[model samples]
Target chain A: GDDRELAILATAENLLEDRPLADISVDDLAKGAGISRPTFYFYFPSKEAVLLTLLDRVVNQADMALQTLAENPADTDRENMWRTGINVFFETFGSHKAVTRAGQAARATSVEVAELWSTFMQKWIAYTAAVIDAERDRGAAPRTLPAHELATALNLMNERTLFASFAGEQPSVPEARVLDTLVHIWVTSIYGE
Target chain B: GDDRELAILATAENLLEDRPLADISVDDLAKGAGISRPTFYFYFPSKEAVLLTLLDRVVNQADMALQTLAENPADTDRENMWRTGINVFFETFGSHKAVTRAGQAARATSVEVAELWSTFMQKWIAYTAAVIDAERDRGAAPRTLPAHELATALNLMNERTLFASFAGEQPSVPEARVLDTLVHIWVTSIYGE
Candidate 1:
């Protein structure tokens, strides 16, 4: 049990370095891990099953950082809290690009992987909605805008924000620069400038 | 010539509707269009070539609308201008789900298709940059934040927005809601409120 899971992840990781997650065959994965083909299935139902575990591991760290940012806010400054929360998510994802990339590739080819991705995104969106709820509770954020719409926008915003990092030649936007731009867009769109 | 393009397009479109673009075959296209296999090759070099033309037709109306928005924004309010531009894209895309679905399938199989998509998105980013230019010139949008970041945000926003409509269940959002959400994001992000 000790070497088995580690062996599977190691072999799968090696295979990913050479080929995309979708292109890797079960035979290749099994052979690389030095296990029988059926034995590979015995451990992980599919290649995607293995990858989702890895993806969950990476996104978990990001989620914890998000929880910290959301749970604590300074006195007399709600937007600072909002900005800090996004930065936590941003930094975690930027550091874990490979895992996220694999997850995206796996999600594209498999329904199970895609469902896992949707769940994470939906939860994160909910977290953003809660942050807005706090602001509205304090009478800082707009009362006119619907909570779902604001939450959806924040979710959509995070989705777009991370995608740009993927699209970059190298996602080298300075941390301050990234936070500045994110704050710029979120506040103005939700409230009149 | 008319019949030649029409036959190829119809056959390719039919194939795309039935299965992923990666699964389409020249033989099937030829049989459906009642043309020689060689004739299909003469008109289009590859499956992706056929898709490019299909998308061109679908997006032509949107392209014209974007052009008009760029040229005549003085005639429209900022929100109205965005409504017109984004509706052209989202409505045209949501109507031809299979075609865009084919494009997504193509992206998975070929870097050429991926590059083509990136190229189109780059142009889209540039056009929105010009609109930001217009907005700033008209004294509506703020001048503090860089235009390029917001331009990239809008570009990524459209990609996610359209992809959701194409891939999601039938009860998709209406064009007005999409415009409202998009405008809200843009106005807030730019103003840094």
Candidate 2:
């Protein structure tokens, strides 16, 4: 939360846009932030630590977006709410494409970062499961599968699809269509409509 | 492939199960295959090249599996065939978990490997699109989204879901459930049961 530390994080995130996380060095981060290497080291242990911190920020932003759906669980307009929840997620995630891309890319190799990603995803899965459970209780949604498993499957779908498309590891579809397709999956899975 | 070349590729894949792609070296690959580093270089330019070769094998296997769906477009029991197609895909893909995981991890950072992955995914997408188009023609599937876009989304879902689950990047769920969930999405999207 310190100003200089925040500057370092911001600079590292911006650098990720132009290059991979492996390409960014502490000296480069310090230089971009207008600070000395020792100062950068004083603030963070390593470049990866900067990435971890940025990842937390992005996950927190998206979690806040997820909370919107959690707040209105009893709303009659479930479809629109689910649609809005997805839009908020992508909008918040797309805003930090560099951070999301780096975080996702790092998850495969970095144990610490992988756990961090898994932790955030579990939080989301739990949130989604609760919504599904509520819908089933109200007889608005079916119980074809357990809520948690369904939630886990859907959350991973979004995570992987968005990460691949943004990272250029797969063909990029229009963002609107991606959102619509995802919403359709979520709504139909839960509401059975 | 030559016996020696196949040995090197197998050695690289076996090593991947124990370590990340970045941790495996050309020397390690050669030693595991009972060859010298020079010989390894003679057969493959880099460790990533071995990975590229293995990835091609897995994709080819999966592409062949996808062809089963394309070949039988008019089967009265289309949903069952689609489910079988998905099962074949996971079976082929799951058989080479290490190769699939390593290739997916490498895609984030290595340009050559990413292109290799993108190219294969494109082939599978085209294959899936043709099936969706045929289903629509028979009045079986919906026309809400374009066949190509819909196919891309479905493929990405399976891909991201399988990759994350295999890589141990998320909460572990039963492989059967993962397969079932994916089949559900694919069939429901195409047939709308």
Candidate 3:
């Protein structure tokens, strides 16, 4: 049943919050969800599939937050917009940190997860590149690097930096400090001020 | 004997070049090094210990590269030092990509490795911070963030960026591109041009 599938997904997320995706087995998920191992398989092909489904759900939520930037007027305050965009992205990332960590670890070993992550990252890069192009056209941002490449670098910086801070065994810096530092880098990189 | 221990470490490093640190078990490592499991334990407690030993060896080499910066005159070509510093760091990182990858992964799951990484990173951060402070005192660099904080951020950026590109399942950007882009970020962050 759909509810059973949801239970399996939800249970896996819960387990992930306490341990790595690698440490969680099908039996663990099934037992946690009050289902048999075969039932777990019927609901999902594997643990990775459950993690992927969770990632997609969270990413889609993050996508909605990113889309709001598009609706703002072109003349809106760039500094505030940049900060808000980062805050939203990081906030969404924080909410689903366990799933995000699972997805990050899974991506390295799973082709499906890797492609999914690449596609998700490319979406943000594309959006950021569009913003860069708009700013450059408005004679506001620097044109040192092409918008697409610059966007790719900046997006990757955020992803990698945030991943290390959130998913690593010990976060080197506090989340608030990391947030402010990231915002500063993003603004400076784009506005060159 | 130390020779036997050396053989074990070498075998583990060789194995890492072809697979992830997580994928190699104690049995795999022991057999490759021509040691029994107990013999392996006699030399090191776990697979991670071998990785840690290999990491220490490579990082020590990288430290020599970093130390060269200290030999330059105070006013001796800031830009060249900057480029050379980054080149040496990345070159060292690239040369031991496999061991570095193993260390990076181990840090996420091992408290000992995490502390080891933190200490290693602090050494580089201290070096960069000193350089930043010197540049600011000489009016060669801007006083944006505190030197220590800025150095921490920049060093972490390089660590996260380079690690992802080198050790990731698929590097999102080319090696040359990632290196140049990181150098650009570091230079711009400090010089503010």
Candidate 4:
């Protein structure tokens, strides 16, 4: 991150605390960052562009959990790989509700956010599919369905439940209940017991 | 549906084909429905309101499939209850892309549409849960996961996959492949086969 770029990102992050991404004007963003409006454009083209950067920052934190799943294709006594990764999924999104909501909101209306959203989903789906493939290869899990399709559905389920919760459209499901339920379905769906 | 009400709904449906729900004005709806501008509000409060009315119509066709699952606790020779219900889900949503997209588009920004969308998801989740509960009690499928939670996840998976496809983001999954994969996941998740 460059000097002006970093300043603009921090300003945008604070703006999100009080108002939605759409309501915050570029001029306000520039003044908050101690730069001219013309300079703000040089550092970031739009408020959403600054948000995508903040989104990436938060996503990188979640990426560590996905990395754990990708690196290990087997179960552990303390916790299964699925539980660990999914726990991070719930925890990460829960902690970053502001940024998560920003991304979901912008993705619905912004072309740039939609493309980035697809990339984020594609990465998770691809990584999950590989893990599923490795499990069957090692005789750990059965070939219940096509590995890629199954991964797509399971990951998409996680995204939808998490997204719906933030939107307040879904009822309040307890943390333990959500965690254990997801682990159970994912385990049974793959291992069949 | 009353005469003017039906005409308004029909007009809104056609308008969605060429433009998004937010872009259409009350006057256009009134003109198309052959009513005065002020009369549009008498029949439906807003454009999103009319869209929700249309959404209900498409959803009723999908309800029969849910009914099939609820009424029968076991499988059929032609297909399992899950396949039948899910098939209708895909078919109904795919066939009614205009209304489906309208609901999705509005639900992102409209409180009214989001409330209705929640009810739609709740009904499916409730019916699927009941079917699962009956299956376990009768020794048809195992009690691997809690009935209601499992039903929520599975139904959510279908909704996400279908929605993503309509957005042109999800990769092209063949109809037969998507059908078979979902059936396998649903059956295995419940029956442990």
Query: What's model 2's TM-score?
Result: 0.92
- The residue-by-residue lDDT of candidate 2 on B1-193, one tens digit each, is 4988989988888898898887888889989888898988899888888898999888888787667656755465766777787777678878899998888777766788888778877887887888789878989777767778778777877887776667655664567677877766677666663
Complex DockQ per candidate: 0.44, 0.53, 0.31, 0.49
TM-score of 4: 0.84
Best candidate according to lDDT: 2
User: Which regions of candidate 2 fall more than 4 Å away from where they truly are?
Assistant: A72-76, B72-76
Chain A TM per prediction: 0.77, 0.92, 0.91, 0.83
- lDDT string for model 2 (A1-193, tens) is 3989989998998899999887889999999888999999999999999999999988888888667656755455777888887777788888888998888777766788888888888887887888789888999887777788778778877876666556555576666577877777777666653
Given the true complex, what DockQ would model 4 score? 0.49
Location of the lowest summed lDDT over 10 successive residues in candidate 2 chain A: A67-76
Interface residue Cα RMSD of candidate 4 after superposition: 2.7
User: Global lDDT of each model?
Assistant: 0.69, 0.79, 0.78, 0.77
lDDT winner, 3 or 4 = 3
Q: Best-fitting candidate, measured by DockQ? A: 2
Specify the CAPRI tier of model 1: acceptable
Q: After superposition, how far is residue A92 of candidate 4 from its true place, in Å?
A: 3.1
Superposition error at B157 for model 4 (Å): 1.5
List candidate 3 segments past 4 Å from native: A22-37, A73-75, A167-171, B1-4, B21-42, B71-76, B167-171
